[PDB]
Amino acid sequence: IGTNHLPLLSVSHIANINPELLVNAGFDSDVSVVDNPYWDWDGTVGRTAPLGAVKVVADGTIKDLLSGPDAIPVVEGQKLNVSAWLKYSGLVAGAGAGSIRLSGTAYSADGEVVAYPDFGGIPDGASGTSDWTQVTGQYVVPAGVTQFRLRLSVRENATGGTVWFDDCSVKKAGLLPQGLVDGLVQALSDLLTWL
Amino acid sequence: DLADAFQAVANLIDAIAGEVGSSLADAIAKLATFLTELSPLNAGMLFGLIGTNHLPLLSVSHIANINPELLVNAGFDSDVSVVDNPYWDWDGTVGRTAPLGAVKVVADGTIKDLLSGPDAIPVVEGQKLNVSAWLKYSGLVAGAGA
Amino acid sequence: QFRLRLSVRENATGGTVWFDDCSVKKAGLLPQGLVDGLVQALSDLLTWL
Amino acid sequence: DLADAFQAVANLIDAIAGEVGSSLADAIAKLATFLTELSPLNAGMLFGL
């Protein structure tokens, strides 16, 4: 639900909760992999029911995948954390720096890409096989950014294997920023400096 | 008469499909595209305004510093908010922003009024507000006064 | 409850008035008297000093 | 039997129109009132949380 449609909140209803942002983050259903000959939905490989994950074949090329839900409204401050359990089976991809790069798409006010902030992924030497591994990325929002999405990127140097992603979680984390309460920053600074 | 009735049945099929000269496949596709009670409901736009009492729990982390607009169709770029009004009508040729839509009024020496199409904006004590709008009077024969 | 009233008074006698880019926005920031007892605590500290 | 079938066709006209003894104008009006995925959705009440 958009921000401009919420006219008035409830101070009592305000509380401390950090819920998930994306819809169908765990890829447990067919949504978010719609109309794509590159990726597809799977119901037999995964951890959480119904064992739904993303299947893909790396034919020596680059790979990208977009979240089904639209842009998450991201703003300055309000740090975020991004994580996901990734796996690569039969990875014949070239052993190098790149391949899996868990990152996001930061769209501007009109919806323009500004950067490719990598919050995790595999290190150099992209080859072999592994299991569900988690990469954690703390993202701090630069100014002039309004929209966010979670992108799944695999560098062009990849040359084989099947990549699985599950339990995706992009969360807004932290407490109330100091510079939102009225004049409190100035008052506390004044008291401390006076003392 | 029998041929007319059979063509009426065909027209019923086409209408439940959504367009004249359609098929039963189009009919069932339209019925599937319609969202029933148990089916999901899109959150893409949700025009209007969501009341406060329906918001049980917010997110302190999600709280941040943004000031968005309040009214819906505030730019008068569409037909909403000017419906059923002899005094004021929507104009698709006059406007600074696309599709160049504004409000037109035939001031016949009288008082004219305009209200926002969306329902009440909920405000409370404190909570300062800012109001602005770009106005332009053309051919104003209105008497020079207060 | 609040609505945007747009009124051309009765003493007017002619013309056509156009409006665009109407913007009524709730402005400001978090009021002081919403956090719990913080007003009293800050006042107490300042008055103590 | 044929008269019953024709009256059934008329009853389906009325059923699409949402009320017995209505016309194709009411049928297409009800079709317009039908809300699809692409149709705008009113935030009037939205009962629940």
From residue A153, give the alpha-carbon distance in Å to each of A94, A98, C10, C42.
15, 9, 64, 50
Give me the residue from D16, D37, D44 closest to B42, CB to CB.
Answer: D37
Chain A residues 10-49 with a CB less than 8 Å from chain C:
11
Contact A135, A102 (CB under 8 A): yes
Chain A contacts of C31, Cβ < 8 Å? 182
Please list, in sequence order, all residues whose beta carbon lies within 8 angstroms of the beta carbon of residue B129, skipping any fewer than 6 positions away: B123, C2, C24, C25, C26, C27
* Contact (Cβ atoms closer than 8 angstroms) between residue A182 and residue A188: no
Name the residue type at position B43.
Answer: A
Amino acid letter, A157: N
One-letter amino acid of A69: P
Instruction: Please check whether residue A158 is in contact with residue A58, taking contact to mean a CB–CB distance below 8 angstroms.
Output: yes
Strand runs labelled E in chain A: 39-42, 53-56, 63-66, 72-73, 77-89, 100-107, 118-121, 133-134, 137-141, 147-154, 162-172
> Rounded to an integer, what distance in angstroms lies between the CA atom of residue A74 and that of residue A70?
12
C2 SS3 class: strand
Q: A3 near A152, Cβ under 8 Å?
A: no
Which resolution, in Å, applies to this structure? 3.3
Q: Cα-Cα-Cα-Cα dihedral of A67, A69, A72, A73, to 10°?
A: 150
Integer Cα distance of A151 and A84 in angstroms: 12
Helix H or strand E segment including B60: none
Name the H helices within B64-108. Answer: none
Long-range contacts of range C9-13, CB-CB < 8 Å, 24 or more positions apart? C9/B111, C9/B146, C10/B110, C10/B111, C11/B142, C11/B143, C11/B145, C11/B146, C12/B107, C12/B109, C12/B110, C12/B111, C12/B112, C12/B142, C12/B143, C13/B107, C13/B109, C13/B141, C13/B142, C13/B143
CB contact under 8 A, B136 and C17: yes
DSSP C6-46: EEE-TT--S-EEEEEEEEEEE-S-B-GGGSSSHHHHHHHHH
Residue A84 DSSP class: E
**Please, what sign has the CA dihedral across residues A15, A19, A22, A24?**
negative
D29 vs D23: CA distance, rounded Å: 10
Structure tokens, A38? 């590159």
**Residues linked to residue B104 through DSSP beta bridges, in sequence order:** B89
Residue B129: list chain C partners with CB under 8 A. Answer: 2, 24-27
- Going by C-beta distance under 8 Å and a sequence separation of 6 or more, which residues neighbour residue B130? C23, C24, C25, C27
Chains B+A touching (3+ CB pairs under 8 Å): yes
Largest CA distance in chain B: 72
Q: Does C32 touch chain B (CB under 8 A)?
A: no
Nearest to B91 by CA among B102, B78, B80, B107: B102
CA count, 13 A, side-chain hemisphere, A186: 3
Which residues of chain B are within 8 Å of residue C31 when distances are taken between CB atoms? 126-127
**Residues facing C16 on adjacent strands:** B138
Contact state of A195 with C49 under an 8 Å Cβ cutoff: yes
* DSSP 8-state secondary structure symbol assigned to residue B120: P
Strands (E), chain B: 88-91, 102-105, 112-114, 129-138
Instruction: Report the distance separating Cα A95 and Cα A157, nearest Å.
Output: 9
Query: Within chain D, how many helices (H) and strands (E) appear?
Result: 2, 0
Per DSSP, the three-state class of B59 is: coil
Q: Would the CB atoms of A11 and C34 count as touching at under 8 Å?
A: yes
Closest to A93 measured CA to CA, from A116, A65, A62 = A62
Q: Which of residues 151-180 of A touch C (CB under 8 A)?
A: 176, 180
